[model samples]
Target: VSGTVCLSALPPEATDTLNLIASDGPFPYSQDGVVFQSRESVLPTQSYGYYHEYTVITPGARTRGTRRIITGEATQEDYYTGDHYATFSLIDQTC
Candidate 1:
C-alpha cells in the first residue's frame, strides 16, 4: 500500500516534523532524530544510519502515535507512514 503524496496532503503534525527536520529541531520527542532501520523494507534500500525518524503528534493519542516521518539522509527523501511502517508514501515536498 505504498505510493506518493504531496506534502500538503499530510497531517499538520507531519508538516511540523518536516520543518523541524529542516531546522535540525528542538524536536518534541527524544527519539525524533534517531536512526530508523528499514526493517520493514518499505523504503528504498539504503545503508545503515542513512535513515532517520521523526514522530508526528497524534492530537489525542496518549503516546507517540503510529504516524512518522522517515527521512533518507543521503537523498533527502521523505516518507510518511501512518501505520508504524506497515506501509509508506513518498512525500513530494517540491510543491
Candidate 2:
C-alpha cells in the first residue's frame, strides 16, 4: 500500500495551537499494520511556509483500510504534563 498525504496551515486562533500525531488501528475493521513513518513539524503561524507532505508505503494485506490524518490543538488542561510534542502522523492505504 502506498499514497501521498499533504497538509497546509490554517488560520491560527490565539487559543488554538496546531499538533499532529500518527496512529494505526485494530485488525478486522482496521488492517492494523505499519510500513513507513515520517516525522511531523508544527508551525506557529499559517502560511505556505507551514505546509507539509508525506509519502507513505505499506505492505500488502498488512496495511489498514481505516486511516486518518490527525491535526489540532491542545487545551490548557491537556498540558498537565507540560507541552505535548507532536508525533508523526501515520498514512495507511491498500496497494
Candidate 3:
C-alpha cells in the first residue's frame, strides 16, 4: 500500500524556503531528516513554485526508523550539502 502528504497548507514562506533549498540541491546535508540517495542527481530548476507530485517511499521494518530526509550545507569532513531539511511521518503499522 501507499499514501501521500499534502503540503498545500504549508505557508508560502515555507514553500519558498523549500524551493530555495531544492534549487541548491535535492539532497539534505544535515541532521534534520532522512535523505535518500539516488544513482542520479535531481537538481531543482525553480526557486519559487509548487510541488504537486512529491513522491516518498516507505522502508522495511528494520530500516523504518532510519528513514528520514534532512537538508543542510556540507561540512569540512562531508562532501554533500546540509542546509534545510524536512521529514515525513509514517502512520501505517503493517510492513
Candidate 4:
C-alpha cells in the first residue's frame, strides 16, 4: 500500500543512499543492486526485477548495518527502511 515519507525527514545517511542509487553506483557493499526478493512481503508486491535494494551505510556499525534504500525504477518510486527490510516508507527521488 505504499506508505509515504518526506525526503527532508530522512536521516542524512538515507540521503547519501539515494545519491548512491542515482549514480549507477559504486555501491559500498557487494549486495547493492541485487534483485530484492521481498520474501517477507513487507513491501508492495511485484514480480521479479521490479525491485532493487541498496545499502544505507549506518554511521558506526561493524557491518553493512540494517538501513537500506530500495527502489522501483529510477525516479518512479523509492522506499526507505532504517530497520532493514522489516519496514519501509516510500519517498521522493529529490528533496
Question: Which candidate should be chosen as best, given TM-score against the real structure?
Answer: 1
Query: Where does model 4 exceed 4 Å of error?
Result: 93-95
- Say which prediction, candidate 1 or candidate 2, comes out ahead on lDDT: 1
lDDT of 4 by residue, 1-95 (tens): 34788889877888887778778888778899999987676876788898998888877889998888888864558888887677888886455
How accurate locally is residue 61 in candidate 2, as Cα lDDT from 0 to 100?
Answer: 34
Q: Report the C-alpha displacement of residue 94, candidate 2, in angstroms.
A: 31
How far off is model 1, as Cα RMSD? 1.4
Per-residue lDDT, model 4, residue 72, is 84
* TM-score of model number 3: 0.24
For model 3, residues 6-73, the per-residue Cα lDDT tens digits are 34533243344345455753533332233434212242322322111221223243322332232323
lDDT of 2 at 54: 19
Q: Candidate 2 vs. truth: CA RMSD?
A: 15.2
Candidate 4, run of 10 with poorest lDDT: 67-76
Candidates by lDDT, descending order: 1, 4, 3, 2
lDDT, candidate 3, residue 50? Answer: 17
- lDDT winner among the candidates? 1
Tens-place lDDT digits, model 2, residues 62-81: 64222233322332111100
User: Considering only N, C-alpha and C atoms within 3 Å, which residue pairs clash in candidate 4?
Assistant: none
The local lDDT score (0 to 100) that residue 91 gets in candidate 1 is: 91
Clashing pairs in 1: none
